[PDB]
Amino acid sequence: TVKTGIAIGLNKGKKVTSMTPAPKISYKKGAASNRTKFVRSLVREIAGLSPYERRLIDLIRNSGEKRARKVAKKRLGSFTRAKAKVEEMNNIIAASRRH
Protein backbone atom coordinates (compact mmCIF):
# COMPACT_ATOMS: atom_id res chain seq x y z
CA THR A 1 0.00 0.00 0.00
CA VAL A 2 3.05 2.22 -0.36
CA LYS A 3 2.82 5.17 -2.70
CA THR A 4 4.59 5.23 -6.06
CA GLY A 5 6.02 8.75 -6.05
CA ILE A 6 4.24 9.96 -9.19
CA ALA A 7 1.03 11.96 -9.51
CA ILE A 8 -1.27 9.41 -11.22
CA GLY A 9 -1.73 5.66 -11.38
CA LEU A 10 -2.78 2.98 -8.95
CA ASN A 11 -0.88 4.05 -5.84
CA LYS A 12 -0.27 7.71 -6.69
CA GLY A 13 1.14 10.05 -4.07
CA LYS A 14 4.31 10.99 -2.26
CA LYS A 15 6.30 8.33 -0.43
CA VAL A 16 6.47 9.26 3.25
CA THR A 17 7.60 6.94 6.02
CA SER A 18 4.55 5.61 7.83
CA MET A 19 3.76 5.34 11.53
CA THR A 20 0.73 2.96 11.92
CA PRO A 21 -0.94 4.74 14.87
CA ALA A 22 -2.55 3.15 17.90
CA PRO A 23 -6.07 1.78 17.31
CA LYS A 24 -9.00 3.81 18.56
CA ILE A 25 -11.38 2.09 20.95
CA SER A 26 -14.41 3.58 19.13
CA TYR A 27 -13.53 1.40 16.11
CA LYS A 28 -14.75 -1.61 18.13
CA LYS A 29 -18.21 -0.29 19.00
CA GLY A 30 -20.19 -3.08 17.42
CA ALA A 31 -18.11 -5.85 18.99
CA ALA A 32 -20.13 -8.41 20.94
CA SER A 33 -19.27 -8.96 24.59
CA ASN A 34 -19.83 -12.10 26.64
CA ARG A 35 -22.34 -10.41 28.93
CA THR A 36 -24.50 -9.03 26.11
CA LYS A 37 -24.26 -12.36 24.27
CA PHE A 38 -25.61 -14.09 27.38
CA VAL A 39 -28.39 -11.50 27.74
CA ARG A 40 -29.40 -11.77 24.07
CA SER A 41 -29.49 -15.58 24.19
CA LEU A 42 -31.58 -15.54 27.37
CA VAL A 43 -34.15 -13.05 26.08
CA ARG A 44 -34.38 -14.94 22.79
CA GLU A 45 -35.15 -18.05 24.82
CA ILE A 46 -37.74 -16.11 26.85
CA ALA A 47 -39.51 -14.25 24.02
CA GLY A 48 -39.34 -16.75 21.18
CA LEU A 49 -40.27 -15.67 17.67
CA SER A 50 -42.17 -12.86 15.97
CA PRO A 51 -44.86 -13.79 13.39
CA TYR A 52 -42.77 -12.81 10.37
CA GLU A 53 -39.92 -14.90 11.77
CA ARG A 54 -42.30 -17.85 12.14
CA ARG A 55 -43.47 -17.55 8.55
CA LEU A 56 -39.83 -17.26 7.48
CA ILE A 57 -39.17 -20.56 9.32
CA ASP A 58 -41.97 -22.05 7.24
CA LEU A 59 -40.46 -20.56 4.07
CA ILE A 60 -37.05 -22.19 4.63
CA ARG A 61 -38.89 -25.44 5.45
CA ASN A 62 -41.08 -25.32 2.33
CA SER A 63 -40.17 -22.86 -0.42
CA GLY A 64 -36.42 -22.47 0.03
CA GLU A 65 -33.98 -19.73 0.91
CA LYS A 66 -34.53 -17.72 -2.29
CA ARG A 67 -38.21 -17.12 -1.54
CA ALA A 68 -37.28 -16.70 2.13
CA ARG A 69 -34.79 -13.96 1.22
CA LYS A 70 -37.30 -12.27 -1.10
CA VAL A 71 -39.94 -12.17 1.64
CA ALA A 72 -37.38 -11.00 4.21
CA LYS A 73 -36.21 -8.27 1.83
CA LYS A 74 -39.81 -7.12 1.50
CA ARG A 75 -40.30 -7.33 5.27
CA LEU A 76 -37.07 -5.74 6.50
CA GLY A 77 -35.42 -2.84 4.74
CA SER A 78 -32.50 -4.09 2.71
CA PHE A 79 -31.08 -7.21 1.11
CA THR A 80 -28.18 -7.27 3.60
CA ARG A 81 -30.52 -7.41 6.59
CA ALA A 82 -32.58 -10.02 4.73
CA LYS A 83 -29.51 -12.22 4.19
CA ALA A 84 -28.44 -11.93 7.83
CA LYS A 85 -31.99 -12.65 9.04
CA VAL A 86 -32.33 -15.73 6.82
CA GLU A 87 -28.91 -16.93 8.01
CA GLU A 88 -29.82 -16.63 11.68
CA MET A 89 -33.22 -18.27 11.11
CA ASN A 90 -31.45 -21.17 9.41
CA ASN A 91 -29.30 -21.36 12.55
CA ILE A 92 -32.50 -21.50 14.67
CA ILE A 93 -33.81 -24.33 12.45
CA ALA A 94 -30.56 -26.27 12.89
CA ALA A 95 -30.55 -25.72 16.67
CA SER A 96 -34.20 -26.74 17.06
CA ARG A 97 -33.54 -29.81 14.91
CA ARG A 98 -30.68 -30.64 17.28
CA HIS A 99 -33.13 -30.10 20.16
Binding site: V16, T17, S18, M19, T20, P21
Partner: peptide, 9 residues
Protein backbone atom coordinates in the same frame (compact mmCIF):
# COMPACT_ATOMS: atom_id res chain seq x y z
CA UNK B 1 -6.10 13.70 14.81
CA UNK B 2 -3.69 10.85 14.20
CA UNK B 3 -0.02 10.43 13.32
CA UNK B 4 0.64 8.69 10.02
CA UNK B 5 3.66 10.82 8.99
CA UNK B 6 6.94 10.48 10.87
CA UNK B 7 8.29 13.84 9.65
CA UNK B 8 5.22 15.72 10.91
CA UNK B 9 5.39 13.72 14.15
Amino acid sequence: RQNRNQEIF
